[PDB]
Amino acid sequence: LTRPDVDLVNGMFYADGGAREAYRWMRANEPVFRDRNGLAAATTYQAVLDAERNPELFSSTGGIRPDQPGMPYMIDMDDPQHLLRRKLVNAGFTRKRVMDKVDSIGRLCDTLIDAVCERGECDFVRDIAAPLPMAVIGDMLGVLPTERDMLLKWSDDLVCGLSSHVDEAAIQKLMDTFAAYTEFTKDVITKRRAEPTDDLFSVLVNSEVEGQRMSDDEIVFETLLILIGGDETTRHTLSGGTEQLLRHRDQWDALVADVDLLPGAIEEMLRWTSPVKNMCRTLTADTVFHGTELRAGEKIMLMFESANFDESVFGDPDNFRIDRNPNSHVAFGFGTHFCLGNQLARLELRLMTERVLRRLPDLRLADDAPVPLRPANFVSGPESMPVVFTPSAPVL
Numbered sequence: 552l553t554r555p556d557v558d559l560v561n562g563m564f565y566a567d568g569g570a571r572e573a574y575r576w577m578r579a580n581e582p583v584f585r586d587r588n589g590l591a592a593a594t595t596y597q598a599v600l601d602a603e604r605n606p607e608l609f610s611s612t613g614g615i616r617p618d619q620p621g622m623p624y625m626i627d628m629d630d631p632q633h634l635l636r637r638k639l640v641n642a643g644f645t646r647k648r649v650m651d652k653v654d655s656i657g658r659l660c661d662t663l664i665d666a667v668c669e670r671g672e673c674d675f676v677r678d679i680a681a682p683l684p685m686a687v688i689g690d691m692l693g694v695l696p697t698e699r700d701m702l703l704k705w706s707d708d709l710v711c712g713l714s715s716h717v718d719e720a721a722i723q724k725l726m727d728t729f730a731a732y733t734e735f736t737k738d739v740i741t742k743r744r745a746e747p748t749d750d751l752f753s754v755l756v757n758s759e760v761e762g763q764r765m766s767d768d769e770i771v772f773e774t775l776l777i778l779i780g781g782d783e784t785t786r787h788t789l790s791g792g793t794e795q796l797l798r799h800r801d802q803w804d805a806l807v808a809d810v811d812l813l814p815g816a817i818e819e820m821l822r823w824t825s826p827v828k829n830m831c832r833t834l835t836a837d838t839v840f841h842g843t844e845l846r847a848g849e850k851i852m853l854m855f856e857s858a859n860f861d862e863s864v865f866g867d868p869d870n871f872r873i874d875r876n877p878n879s880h881v882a883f884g885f886g887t888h889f890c891l892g893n894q895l896a897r898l899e900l901r902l903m904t905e906r907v908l909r910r911l912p913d914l915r916l917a918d919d920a921p922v923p924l925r926p927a928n929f930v931s932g933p934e935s936m937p938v939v940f941t942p943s944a945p946v947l
């Protein structure tokens with residue numbers, strides 16, 4: 552009944568377990584809510600949809616983070632500049648193009664499962680959920696296999712860096728990692744200019760925008776956006792979604808018995824886990840929006856998890872149900888910026904989860920205590936997830 556006392560920039564808010572109670576208050580009392588620091592947030596599904604649908608008023612050019620300015624990548628652009636970038640990269644992410652990767656991604660899943668299946672135990676986050684989407688996007692970008700862990704470590708350092716709650720040495724670590732990624736990329740530019748390859752790095756390196764070559768700085772940021780979209784999102788729906796399947800044994804069992812129930816289960820895993828907790832928009836004019844007066848130039852946080860637990864839309868959002876149908880979640884956002892990777896992510900989720908179901912059919916949590924979550928304010932999910940299963944033989 553009492554107003555939440557919350558800093559939406561504090562990663563602890565997303566990790567401590569209180570967020571969904573706080574969102575319930577917000578959606579009932581103050582749909583466009585201001586936190587203890589005055590930062591506006593769209594908290595109801597309608598408020599998020601309406602802002603998404605009006606980019607003239609709710610611009611992306613001010614930067615998607617609450618505490619950082621506009622940067623040279625497509626997520627911080629409005630149309631028509633944004634669509635020009637999308638047209639450079641869309642072809643590699645369509646459903647048809649993604650479906651061409653069924654065998655290739657399936658082999659990565661079997662490799663990873665081969666690595667643990669004889670042991671009867673693993674850390675589902677470290678051994679399964681994190682590496683698979685890293686390998687997929689790394690192959691798309693032309694990362695050598697032996698370079699995947701290094702890029703993944705950098706990607707972790709960049710997004711774990713995101714909180715008002717971390718010390719100024721965690722801030723230098725953030726900037727040092729970015730500088731590392733920048734020098735790596737500027738060397739990739741040298742290489743793909745001289746020796747172009749088939750992959751997404753090379754396409755960005757050699758791409759044109761406004762009839763001049765894409766800026767080296769925009770190449771840094773666009774490739775970074777694709778990498779992190781790739782390697783810091785799906786991992787959390789794989790681990791947090793599988794957690795919920797383990798906690799609802801009857802649903803796990805239904806899937807083991809009937810793989811045709813999988814597509815629906817994935818949509819519920821997405822809704823439940825909502826890996827991307829928010830994205831900002833900047834007001835281009837003073838307005839009144841769902842009864843909150845908003846000032847030109849301030850940001851508003853689109854709260855996707857809050858929208859995804861909106862009772863007026865889902866009826867019973869607090870039950871996890873693989874049979875939820877339809878499942879109109881906005882884990883991937885909505886509108887012109889609607890997730891580029893969303894078919895890639897769904898196919899990663901399908902192919903891995905099917906192999907886990909088939910090959911580790913008595914999977915369980917090592918203990919049913921809460922799974923620890925990353926206290927960061929942008930992307931977050933399970934930090935680790937020890938699991939156990941009856942050992943079995945490798946397949947590849």
Ligand code: HEM
Pocket residue numbers: 603625626627637688776777778780781782784785788821825826827830855882883884885886887888889890891892893895896
């Ligand atoms: C479960 C996995 C994922 C989730 C929950 C997720 C979520 C999101 C969300 C919320 C946005 C912003 C949408 C908006 O503001 O309306 C977005 C944008 C984006 N995503 Fe994803 N994403 C995931 C996977 C991926 C993958 C695998 C990639 C590519 C490797 C990726 C690439 C991008 C890009 C490039 C954008 C910016 C698109 C644009 O501005 O037009 N995402 N995603």
Ligand SMILES: CC(C)CCC[C@@H](C)[C@H]1CC[C@H]2[C@@H]3CCC4=CC(=O)CC[C@]4(C)[C@H]3CC[C@]12C
Pocket residue numbers: 616619709710725726729775776779780783784827930
């Ligand atoms: C999950 C995806 C859809 C979105 C991924 C967006 C990623 C690439 C964004 C989010 C926060 C961004 C960082 C914010 C802090 C920052 C300030 C700088 O002065 C250099 C660039 C960095 C180091 C930014 C690099 C790009 C990051 C890491």
